Amino acid sequence: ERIRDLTSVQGVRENSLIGYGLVVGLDGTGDQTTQTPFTTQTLNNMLSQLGITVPTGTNMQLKNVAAVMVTASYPPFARQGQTIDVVVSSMGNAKSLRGGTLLMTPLKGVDSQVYALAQGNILVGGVNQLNGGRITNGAIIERELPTQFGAGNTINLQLNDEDFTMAQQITDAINRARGYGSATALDARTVQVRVPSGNSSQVRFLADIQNMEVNVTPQDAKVVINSRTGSVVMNREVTLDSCAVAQGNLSVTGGSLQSVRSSANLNSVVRALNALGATPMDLMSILQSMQSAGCLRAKLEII
């Protein structure tokens, strides 16, 4: 299952669909509709379409209706009649969407064409979000996308993470179980494979390819710091050099300057960094300072 988990097929991709709708059946937790004119305007549009023309000059003050935006993913090779999941998010001053029902909503693409029609019952968790829900199989595909799959004798596998070693390894793995010249790497992120002419032939070839297992090679040393959530993650290839670290309210347990032992593997790094007795908030600053000095032999990314 390595090749499918590492790469993606060229032309097999997911698009994004968006639309506007109304959610009805709320228990008095809808829009105020006095500060969100589009809710009442679109309700009047729906009624006018259905055969009820409400007078232009009138005051409608609803409480069970909310104006929402619906987002979905158009899956690869989607055919009309299939169903997809949608996400429903409130748009103006609505308290909750607990037990609402999404009315008929056309999901447009980037090209402003309807690719799906959405309508269903929203499932809201019930510290849980109240203005956001999900409808499983809530939208039906109405339009299909032409594709070039099955045409030509080349298929590109696109690596999720760029690596010359991994690209070469996938090339050598495809060229071991599937013939001599069945794959050629084009760059650090693309492996071009030669496929038989046809549609089912390429499907069979890619089915074979996808479940093959490749031995993942060492992949860069990096320390990911998320300051907004206060988390630090170090992969296996992170090392350290011997150097001294000082920080506020931290001391040898006896001065404030603690020596960090050079470290070869990740267990040594973890032990050396835990010897400092540093909170992760302090550990982030320690890692940044060590990266500046040169003790930390890894790529420090702040996400």
Partner: peptide, 8 residues
């Protein structure tokens, strides 16, 4: 008269 909150 229409109040700011929308009630009459």
């Amino acid at each position: 008269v229409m109040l700011p909150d929308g009630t009459s």
